[PDB]
Write a protein that binds this DNA or RNA. Structure first.
Lengths: 85, 82, 80, 205
RNA sequence: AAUUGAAGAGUUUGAUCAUGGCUCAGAUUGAACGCUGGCGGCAGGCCUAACACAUGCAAGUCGAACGGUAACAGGAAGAAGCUUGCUUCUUUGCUGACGAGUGGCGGACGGGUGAGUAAUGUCUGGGAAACUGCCUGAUGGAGGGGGAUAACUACUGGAAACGGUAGCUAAUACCGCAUAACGUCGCAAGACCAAAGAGGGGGACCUUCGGGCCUCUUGCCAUCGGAUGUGCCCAGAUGGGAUUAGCUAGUAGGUGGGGUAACGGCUCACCUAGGCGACGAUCCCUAGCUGGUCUGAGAGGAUGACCAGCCACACUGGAACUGAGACACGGUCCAGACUCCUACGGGAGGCAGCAGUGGGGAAUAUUGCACAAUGGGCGCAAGCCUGAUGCAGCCAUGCCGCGUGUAUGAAGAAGGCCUUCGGGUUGUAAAGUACUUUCAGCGGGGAGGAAGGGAGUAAAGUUAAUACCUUUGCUCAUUGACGUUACCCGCAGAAGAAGCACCGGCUAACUCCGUGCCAGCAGCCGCGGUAAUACGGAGGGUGCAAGCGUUAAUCGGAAUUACUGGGCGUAAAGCGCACGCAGGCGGUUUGUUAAGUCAGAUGUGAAAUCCCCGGGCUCAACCUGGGAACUGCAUCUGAUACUGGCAA
C-alpha cells in the first residue's frame, strides 16, 4: 500500500527467512534427543542433550525463544532422560 | 510510560487543564491513574490560578514518570517563597 | 486467612472429581422475599474421600480442568 | 421577547392596577378600568379553578415583564432553594436588576427602568452591567453612569418616586444617585395582594 | 448544607353508584415537517445502506547508527574570462545539509463504526499460574574476531506492476569464540547462555599525522525490583420466547506425552462413564455493554446519541508472519464479489480516518485554517510530522441571555367591527410631542489564551582543565490558526428587527357574515339538516414568543401488572374434587452456632454527570474547587432478640 513504511514489509520477510532457519535448527536438535530416548540410548541422549542446550539457550538470548520455553525444553528432557536409565 | 500532563477541559476559548497522571498511550482526555491538581490559565489576577498536590507528584517521579513541559513549568512556578 | 465456602456433594462418580452445590440465602431485588439459590461447582478432590450427600468445605485454586477451579479443604458431617 | 403592546389592556384583563404606567395622575380614567378588557368586557365569566390559578400567575408575570420560560426557571430555582418557595419566588423576582432600579426610583415604570439598564447606563458595584435579569446580592451598591446621569428622565422619575411607598429594604440617597441593596425583601413587604401559593399550585398541575 | 415531596378531567345511563377500557392536560428528543424568522453565547449535527466510492489529506522520523552524494547553499583549488582583484567555469563530501538505500524506533497509539456477540462480552467483587518496549531503582558486564548484503556500477526480462544475472562495500544489521553471576536446568555435583558503539571538548605524551590518550554526556548486555499495560480464572448480576424439554462424544473426568509468556481437552493417545438441565440446559428471535440519560413523589418504567470506561470490527471469508505488544483500519499472503488499467501474458484497488460524491431516506453540515496551545511519534536537541486537537464555515437542532424602543398623549381622530342605532369596542393603541441608542451598522482603541525555545553572560556542579556538558539566575531579540478576538470608546438616527397556534366541553380566551348533514372539522365526546360561540372569513380575545404548531417516540397521569400499591359470591377471575413429590411456611422450652440479620471498621465502588456550598464568564446557559452521593460487593471485629442450622 502507498506508504513510505512498506520498507517494514520487506524488512519483515527477510526477518522471517532468518527466523525460520534459526527456529528449524533449534528444534531439530530437540528431535535428536527425542529420537534417542525412544531408542533406549542412555549415553547417546546425554551427549545429544549437551549439544542442544547451548543451542536452545542462545536463541533465548537473541529473542527467538522467550527463555521460558527454552527452560521448558531442558526441564522435560532431563525429566525424560533420567527416567530412561 | 506514565506521564504527568494536562488534560484540556473547559469550554471553547476558556480552557481548563487538569494536571493528571496518565499513560502515554492513552488519549488526552482519556484514561488516567490519578489526577493531582488543575491549572487555570484564564484565571487572571483574581484569587487563584493553579494548584498541584506536589507530594503525590513527587511520589510518581520516584516510581519513574516523565512529566510534560507545562507540568515541569508549574512545579518550577510554585517557587521557594512564592 | 483463606476465603472458603461450605456445600453438599451432589454427585461423585467422575474419577478424582466431585460436584458440590452451595446454597446461598439471597433476597429478591423487587419483592424482598428471601430465596434459596444454588451454586453447583465442580471441585477437586484427590483420592475419592467423599461419597454422595455430605458437607464439603472448599477453597479456590488454579484452574485444573475445564470448569474445575476449586479444591477440597476438609470434610465435616460425613454421610451415613 | 418583550410585550411591545398596549400596557393598559393587560391591567384591565387582571382588573387591578399593575403600575405599568408612570402615573403622573392616578387611575388615568382614560382607559375604562374594571369595566371591559375587550369587546365582550361586560360579559364576566365563571372564572374556573384553573383560571384563577392562571390569572394570578399572569398578573405577577405582567408586573415584572418576564416571559414563561424565564418565569418557570424562577419557580424551578425557588423550589430547590431552601425555605418557603412561595416567598422564594418573590425574592428572586424582586432581586431582578430592572425591578430594583424601579424601586430606587430611577425609572418611572418597569419598562422604562428596563430601557435604562439595557442601554449600558446603570452599573453595579462600580462595574457596568447591561442586562435586566441580573440577580443583585445583599449589600451591593448600584450606581448610575455619568454619561447617562443628568438625563432628562432619571431625576424626573425621582421627584415622582416619593409617593412610591418608600421600599425599606434598600436605602436610596438620590442626590448622588447611588443606593445599596441592604437585604432581601421579606413577604411582609410586597403589596399584600398577590397570592403566590396559586403560582406554586399552578406549576404542580 | 447535600433534597421540601404525590392534583385530575372527558366518555357506557332516562338518571345513579360501581367496575372497566379509551382519550386529554405534563415532561422529554441526535428529531422531522408546516408557517415564521433580529443578534449573541455554549453545545449538538447519516438514527436509514457495516451501501458503493472520484479527488486531496489522515505516520512518520532519525546523519549524534551506516555506506554515501541525487539535489541545495557555501568553502577550498583548478582554470580564465576580465570589474587587475571582479567574474564565468572544472574538480573536492571539504562543510552546512540531504533524495534514494541499509539500520533503529513508531506504525498495535490517536481516529472511526456498532455489523457480529445473550455471554469466548460487560459490570461488581475476588483470585493465581503470567508476560511486559519505552520509564525508573539497584548491582555488575561491555573482551576478541568473522562472513555477508542493499545502495552503487555492468548487462538484461516486462506494457506496467515487478524482476534476473555478475562484480563490489559499511554499520548500533548478522554470526561465532572468550567471559560470567544471587540467571536457566538439575536434589546436588555440574552443565550452559549476552553485548554496540557513537557524540562534544581537551592539557601533557605517542601522534604511522586520520588518531591513540583524558574527561563528560548518551546508548548497549545480563539478573532482580518497581511502575504501567496486557493475558488468564472464579462467583454473582446482566433481554424475550416452554406452542423450544432434553442436550453433549474431546463431550465430562483421570493418567501420560506435547504445546503456551502462563493454568487448562489447549492438543494427542489410553482408561473411567460421565457433564449440563425445570434455579430453564438446548434451540430460536432480538441486541454492543456500562458510567449514565429521560421520566417518576419514590419504587419503578423506558433507553444506551453526545462525553468518558470496556469489547468487537476494518471490501467478504481464512491465515500466519514481524514484533515487547497484532493474528494488524491507511501491513503481508490466500480465496471470493466488485471496480479499473493492459501490448491479453498479467497487474492494481478497499473512506465504518477528515472533508466530499452518488445512492437510500421524513432527515443530519465545509472537498476550510493552523501546529499558537494541549497531547502523540521520532530526535541529544533544533526541529519535522499530526484531518488527534485547537478554531473557523453551515444549520432556530437544543438550552440560555438580549433586542425589536421609552414616557406623555382623548379631537376617546379616521378606519375596521358590533349595536337595542343611543352608542360600544379596537383604543393610550396610533398620530402628535419629549427622550434613549443596547444589539445590528460605521470608524478608533485593545486584553487574555505564551508556557517556552534561541542567543549571550554570571554562578554552581563535574573533570587534569576557567574547555565541553548539566543546572540556576539575568540580559537581549522574538513565537497566536482563531483575529479587522473578547471588551472598551465615538458617530448618526425610533432609525435595521413579530410571529404562530387557539377561542363548544375538557381548556385560558366570542360575536358577526357566508355555507345548509354540503363544503368541512375532529385528541376524545362529537359539530354541519337555515339564526353554527365547534365548518370558512372578518373583528375581538387568550396562550407562547424567535419561535410556534403538527406528526413520531418514551415515561407520567395508569393504583390500568399494584414490591411500594389491585383484585377473584353476582362486574374479568377459585382448578369438578382429592391425594401427594420438589418447593414455600411452621407450636413451645433450653443449650449451642453466628448462616440470615444488625452495628463498627477497612479496601473498593474511575472521571464527568446528579445534589450541596462556593468560584469564574456583564448575569444566565456554560466552566470549575471542595463535599455529599455512588442504595453495592468483599474481608475483618463484635452484637445474639428474631429467623435458620445442630443437640436435648
Amino acid at each position: 500500500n502507498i506508504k513510505s513504511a512498506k520498507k517494514r514489509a520487506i524488512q519483515s520477510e527477510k526477518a522471517r527467512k532468518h527466523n525460520a532457519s534459526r527456529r528449524s535448527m533449534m528444534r531439530t536438535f530437540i528431535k535428536k534427543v527425542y529420537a534417542a530416548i525412544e531408542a533406549g540410548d542412555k549415553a547417546a541422549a546425554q551427549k545429544a542433550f549437551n549439544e542442544m542446550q547451548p543451542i536452545v539457550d542462545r536463541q533465548a538470548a537473541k529473542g527467538l525463544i522467550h527463555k521460558n520455553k527454552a527452560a521448558r525444553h531442558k526441564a522435560n528432557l532431563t525429566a525424560q532422560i533420567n527416567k530412561l536409565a | 510510560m506514565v506521564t504527568i500532563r494536562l488534560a484540556r477541559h473547559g469550554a471553547k476559548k476558556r480552557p481548563f487543564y487538569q494536571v493528571v497522571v496518565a499513560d502515554s498511550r492513552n488519549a488526552r482526555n482519556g484514561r488516567f491513574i490519578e489526577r493531582v491538581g488543575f491549572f487555570n490559565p484564564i484565571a487572571s489576577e483574581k484569587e487563584e490560578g493553579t494548584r498541584l498536590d506536589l507530594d503525590r507528584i513527587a511520589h510518581w517521579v520516584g516510581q519513574g514518570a516523565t512529566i510534560s513541559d507545562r507540568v515541569a513549568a508549574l512545579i518550577k512556578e510554585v517557587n521557594k517563597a512564592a | 486467612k483463606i476465603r472458603t465456602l461450605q456445600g453438599r456433594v451432589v454427585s461423585d462418580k467422575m474419577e478424582k472429581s466431585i460436584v458440590v452445590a452451595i446454597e446461598r440465602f439471597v433476597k429478591h431485588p423487587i419483592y424482598g422475599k428471601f430465596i434459596k439459590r444454588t451454586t453447583k461447582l465442580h471441585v477437586h478432590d484427590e483420592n475419592n474421600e467423599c461419597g454422595i450427600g455430605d458437607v464439603v468445605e472448599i477453597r479456590e485454586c488454579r484452574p485444573l480442568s475445564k470448569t474445575k477451579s476449586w479444591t477440597l479443604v476438609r470434610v465435616v458431617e460425613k454421610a451415613v | 421577547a418583550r410585550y411591545l403592546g398596549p400596557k393598559l389592556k393587560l391591567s384591565r384583563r387582571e382588573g387591578t392596577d399593575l403600575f405599568l404606567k408612570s402615573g403622573v395622575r392616578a387611575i388615568d380614567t382614560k382607559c375604562k378600568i374594571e369595566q371591559a378588557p375587550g369587546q365582550h368586557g361586560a360579559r364576566k365569566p365563571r372564572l374556573s379553578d384553573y383560571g384563577v390559578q392562571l390569572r394570578e400567575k399572569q398578573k405577577v408575570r405582567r408586573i415584572y415583564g418576564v416571559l414563561e420560560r424565564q418565569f418557570r426557571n424562577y419557580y424551578k430555582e425557588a423550589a430547590r432553594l431552601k425555605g418557603n418557595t412561595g416567598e422564594n419566588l418573590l425574592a428572586l423576582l424582586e432581586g431582578r436588576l430592572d425591578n430594583v432600579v424601579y424601586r430606587m426610583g430611577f425609572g418611572a415604570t418597569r419598562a422604562e427602568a428596563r430601557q435604562l439598564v439595557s442601554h449600558k447606563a446603570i452599573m453595579v458595584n462600580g462595574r457596568v452591567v447591561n442586562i435586566a435579569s441580573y440577580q443583585v446580592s445583599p449589600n451591593d451598591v448600584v450606581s448610575i453612569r455619568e454619561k447617562a446621569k443628568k438625563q432628562s428622565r432619571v431625576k424626573a422619575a425621582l421627584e415622582l418616586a416619593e409617593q412610591r411607598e418608600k421600599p425599606t429594604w434598600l436605602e436610596v440617597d438620590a442626590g448622588k444617585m447611588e443606593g445599596t441593596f441592604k437585604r432581601k425583601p421579606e413577604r411582609s413587604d410586597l403589596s399584600a395582594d398577590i397570592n403566590e401559593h396559586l403560582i406554586v399550585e399552578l406549576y404542580s398541575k
